[PDB]
């Protein structure tokens, strides 16, 4: 599931310890997926290429096999860009939600690699720490700089409790 | 004992997004790339005003159907509005020939100005007076096309017209005159007394010859007898030549004509919004970068491409 | 030690599929989405059967050539089914107007019905018994259309005929007739004694005159005259008015005809077969809910979109 | 490589241990597979406008310019819906196997993060068990309930062995 | 302490892409789909050269307008090439009836072969060689299109012509014949006696009369009166037939023709370029495997497809 | 980033070790990502059925409403052509850039499942060993032979040194 709470971005963590919890959104990652998706949309507008035409109805009762020649034209087009923007429409909107997918997985993926054993994978996305993590701990796991040293010993003895 | 998440945004939005394998998606943003929507009104196109003619058809203001007497002075339109029907056409029954190439050739028009080319004051040797019809009323009573004349014999004659008009504007000129098909023997001596007759016209390109059907044919708009009119474009120094000697129904006025660009005759029952627009529908004009619309197929202008759908919604947020 | 393992379904399925990187992979299942076969029927479109001429052109079957008589009543039908090469079309040889427009017209026709307008035995002071020729047998036996009349002089004398018909039905009205181009001056004063012929024809919209071209033409079904044949729809309460004082081959029936849609002309050689569709080719019927066919592009109906593939095949399952 | 014995689904377990072993198919995402390839194929079909036209030669001998404009027409609608339908089914094809692959490697991970280092993966699909996994143990795993605690130190013994 | 890394290419090109997501991608290699380049020369077609007709038009070629006084044979082409105002084409005034269809035509033509139908001496009652005109010279002295001949009076009469040419070639015969308009009766009398003229045109299929229009016109090349040219294409076994009393344009030559294939008209300044191609186009041919061009929309061959784009970049290399 | 030295390939290996380092292409996924990469271009070609037309302008100044059809049919068909196209080219370069990024990925957990614990993940695509790997090592990682056994205990007594 999403998160309610979560109003500054499209990313981002939830952190849980003694000092109380929060939200706080990844502003990169956020942003790429604004760039993308605001670049995907504009490309789907800005590539038609639109040209001036005047559509009538200009040949008389003894000329219905030219009419007849036109409205196949017409209709034709008609069947064309209906199919290709309703298929694509479906396609990209396939796309841009794998895109979300992708984005957050990527973000659990550089946590799950920083913190290794020091913390157990609830397998909900959560992240269960063998220790004790205060704000500039959680901060720190954040911006890509937890040093799994500094509590490997205080982790590799609350692991062999269990 | 210490936690941390990782997650995503959510919302209280409804909108729902289809995708190729899953329907009825709802998500967290979303845009809808196609126009629905329209002002409800006729436009200027890229600046320049339509011709709207209202109870008139093409014909009928052309020739000057008296019914037609609205001539504010457009010397310029970017597309014709005629009404799904017309109330006036052509009031003494017949035909304008080649009409729908007409009507395509002044469907846009950059310069437009009539103008007196054959003055009635002109014809000394024929009644200039008489060429009348209940067929075409003017506050109830008989009259008949503005801008060309209906020629009838004077005394108990009507001489061999032999007239040339050249063409000394700078401009192309369309010209327009017709035949009158009577009805039989006496109407035609009648009228023109010479019971054998004809009109030639000829300019640099064109060589007609015209011969009137005299004929039973059904009433229409109380008259059996018919008028088949004609059309030329007289480039700026050629010269127009007619000749006949009956059933000719002369040009009186003329138009100067400057063409420049193409459009077409749009059919609407509108009316005239004071706004400009890229792209008219006969519906509306619509005001949009959206790359596709359901309004209206028949538009003119630079228009997004015309579709069969309701909606056409891409994702932008997440699922929700 | 205990083992679990994740894994995948496999098959002994040889589909095979292709994707944008990579050819020939065999997968679990597929569906093809090109629909590559047919009934190898003609059928009724919607319900409604279609008009097969057989060995009749459009023109043959209308005017009544001999060989064609058979006429049964379809009252309403689809589309009209000709072969490539009817044999029987215009027997004595010439021209039908506006050939393919009426034929057109005639495609898709909501209700048809042939009526007797002009009754044989009207024409008192013609001769309406000796308009037949060698062009147009009846078993080895010299006939003509018969759904018009080739009038002739009698005793020696063809007064200039006046006549008009009132469509007082509720239903437009089909009506043709002909002129008779004759081959020299002894032919035209055998026939009609008139040297100078012509035929007049007026409703409220048509305004026609119709003159023989007497002049030396090859031979034709053994002959070197010619007859043009020329029509018009009459409206419910107008009348068609007849002049003419030779030369002129005379409507006798006539058609009843509901227009309603449009289709067009099927060619094809095959017969009926009993059954309906939405999507008919001229080698047979689609049954099909397929985006995409290869079978023929000359559909009529509402029929996929027509492509040049052998095969469209989504792969459904996985590699195998 | 892909299993023959699995009947039962798309994707699923083949489980060895001292019952004797067997293969398990993963109904959920099995159902989940079946439900949008078949969207896909509903989509591709569903999405296609149809309309009425008639399609014949009503042109004459001196109509020839005319009938080469609907040469040029039809030609050119047949070869914007050749191109489109081919393509499409070559991405679409694309796609669905990708799609194959994302699923199975999900149901990969998920049993990973269970299992930790309770188990060695062999790195062929399999897991190799520290510790003595009966039916209702497999069965466990299976439906994402395997308690971790449970076994954790027979493995943590196990280990350091050989 | 030792390390094994993985990663992936990378070098100093430049080139650029763009994504759907993300613009001005630097990559490590490229392709370009768009063809944006043609070899500036006319060339032939799947190995048949174009016909070429630098400052004649079709109508002046066929005719023979003397300034196109160059009969070489082609015996076949694969397309016209038609400057956009060729210089020589009606010297004398007037039309050819159905001449866009007439080009279409001849735009492909598998053998085509001068041959004379009807020699000039042939012609013993009347004049063959006062038929001249200062609106078709032929070194700097007054002549006529050489294909046809313009007949006067001899002595002071004009017989009434009755002729017939059979076809007894194998192949199909292309037949041009005229009418003259004259200006006045007196010219009329001055040129063919007699005053009131027709021309009759008899195959198996057409039925022609033509009438002069003698009428006032404007002058063009010098001259008041017109020429109205008309053509058939006459089959193997057929036989024509002409009748005239006057202002008859007679046959003298006519074109043997087998089709097999259709093309059209190009409209270029270029020259032939003594090289082959599948695709032209009236700049430059094209020689590509790309799906796409954007060089010109007037091709004629098997071209890639036309569009608005200066580049279709696809990536083939990573991320630079 | 991306890796100037690496000349004979597209996706491979740095290694860094006593005897100097060195780049090395990954021959096998390199050759599996030109095969399909050329596929799809060819196939972007090769599915453009071509058909042959004459495209000329054969209708006279009292046929400009046929004229004018033919102009909304090519104007039409250019109108789809171009937009397909365009579209066509950015969805395939963004699948394109996406099929490398997943090569590189899948190359890097192929190595990853070979080292096991005897190396520590650094998180920016680099192995560092906890033993002692010469060229003959390192090449043996690289052509999927490494013989975990050889080094368990050298790496097992370097790790938990720290
Ligand atoms: C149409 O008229 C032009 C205009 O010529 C003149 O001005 C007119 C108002 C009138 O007074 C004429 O008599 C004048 O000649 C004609 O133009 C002339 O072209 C001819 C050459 O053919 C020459 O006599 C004049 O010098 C020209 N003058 C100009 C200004 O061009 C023209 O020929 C007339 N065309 C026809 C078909 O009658
Ligand atoms: C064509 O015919 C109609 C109908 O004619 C009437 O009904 C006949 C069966 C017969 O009894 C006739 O004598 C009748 O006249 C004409 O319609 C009538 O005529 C006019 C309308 O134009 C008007 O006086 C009546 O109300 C009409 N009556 C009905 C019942 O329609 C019609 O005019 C004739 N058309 C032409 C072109 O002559
Ligand atoms: C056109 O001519 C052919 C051939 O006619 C014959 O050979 C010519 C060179 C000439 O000298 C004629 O007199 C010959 O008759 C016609 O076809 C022949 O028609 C004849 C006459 O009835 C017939 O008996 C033969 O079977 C045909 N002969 C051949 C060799 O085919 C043809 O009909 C003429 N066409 C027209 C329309 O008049
Ligand atoms: C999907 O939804 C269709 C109509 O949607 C309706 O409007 C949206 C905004 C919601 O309020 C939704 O609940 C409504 O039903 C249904 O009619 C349709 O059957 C649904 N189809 C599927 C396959 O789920
Ligand atoms: C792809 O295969 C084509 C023929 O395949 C045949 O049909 C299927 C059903 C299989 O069962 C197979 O055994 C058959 O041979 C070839 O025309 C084509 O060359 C092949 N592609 C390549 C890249 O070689
Ligand atoms: C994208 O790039 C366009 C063309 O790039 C040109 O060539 C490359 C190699 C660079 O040197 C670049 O600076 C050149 O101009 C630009 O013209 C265009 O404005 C750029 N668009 C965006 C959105 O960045
Ligand atoms: C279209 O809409 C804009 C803003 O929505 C409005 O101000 C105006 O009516 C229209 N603009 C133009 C350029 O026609
Ligand atoms: C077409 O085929 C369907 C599916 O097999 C069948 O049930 C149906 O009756 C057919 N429709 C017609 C009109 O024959
Ligand atoms: C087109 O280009 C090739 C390769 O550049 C050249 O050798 C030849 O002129 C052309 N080939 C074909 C097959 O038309």
């Known amino acids: ?162 | 004992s210490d936690q941390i998440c990782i997650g995503y945004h959510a919302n209280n939005s409804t909108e729902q997004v289809d995708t190729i394998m899953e329907k009825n998606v709802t998500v967290t943003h979303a845009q809808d790339i196609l126009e629905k929507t329209h002002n409800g009104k006729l436009c200027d196109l890229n600046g320049v005003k339509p011709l709207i003619l209202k109870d008139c058809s093409v014909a009928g203001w052309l020739l000057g159907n008296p019914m037609c007497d609205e001539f504010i002075r457009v010397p310029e339109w970017s597309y014709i509005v005629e009404r799904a029907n017309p109330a006036n056409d052509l009031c003494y029954p017949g035909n304008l020939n080649d009409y729908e190439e007409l009507k395509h050739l002044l469907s846009r028009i950059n310069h437009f100005e009539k103008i007196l080319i054959i003055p009635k004051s002109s014809w000394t040797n024929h009644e200039t007076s008489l060429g009348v019809s209940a067929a075409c009323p003017y506050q109830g009573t008989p009259s008949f096309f503005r801008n060309v004349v209906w020629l009838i014999k004077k005394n108990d004659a009507y001489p061999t017209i032999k007239i040339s008009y050249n063409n000394t504007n700078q401009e192309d000129l369309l010209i327009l005159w017709g035949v009158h098909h009577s009805n039989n023997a006496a109407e035609q001596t009648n009228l023109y007394k010479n019971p054998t007759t004809y009109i030639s016209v000829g300019t640099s390109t064109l060589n007609q010859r015209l011969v009137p059907k005299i004929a039973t044919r059904s009433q229409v708009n109380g008259q059996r007898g018919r008028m088949d009119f004609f059309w030329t474009i007289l480039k700026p120094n050629d010269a127009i030549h007619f000749e006949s000697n009956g059933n000719f129904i002369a040009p009186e006025y003329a138009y100067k004509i400057v063409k420049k660009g193409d459009s077409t005759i749009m059919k609407s029952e509108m009316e005239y919004g004071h706004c400009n627009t890229k792209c008219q529908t006969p519906i509306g004009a619509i005001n949009s970068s959206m790359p596709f619309h359901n309004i209206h197929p028949l538009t003119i202008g630079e228009c997004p491409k015309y579709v069969k759908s309701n909606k056409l919604v891409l994702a932008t947020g997440l699922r929700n």
Request: net charge negative.
């Open chain 1, 1 to 162: 599931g999403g998160w309610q709470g979560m109003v500054d971005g499209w990313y981002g963590y939830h952190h849980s310890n003694e000092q109380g919890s929060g939200y706080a959104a990844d502003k990169e990652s956020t942003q790429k997926a604004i760039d993308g998706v605001t670049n995907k949309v504009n490309s789907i507008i800005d590539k038609m290429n639109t040209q001036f035409e005047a559509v009538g109805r200009e040949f008389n009762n003894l000329e219905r096999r030219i009419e007849n020649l036109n409205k196949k034209m017409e209709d034709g087009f008609l069947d064309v860009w209906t199919y290709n923007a309703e298929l694509l429409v479906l396609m990209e909107n396939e796309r841009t939600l794998d895109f979300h997918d992708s984005n957050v997985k990527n973000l659990y993926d550089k946590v799950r690699l920083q913190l290794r054993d020091n913390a157990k994978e609830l397998g909900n996305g959560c992240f269960e720490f063998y220790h004790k993590c205060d704000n500039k701990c959680m901060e720190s796991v954040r911006n890509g700089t937890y040093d799994y040293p500094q509590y490997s010993e205080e982790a590799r003895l609350k692991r062999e409790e269990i």
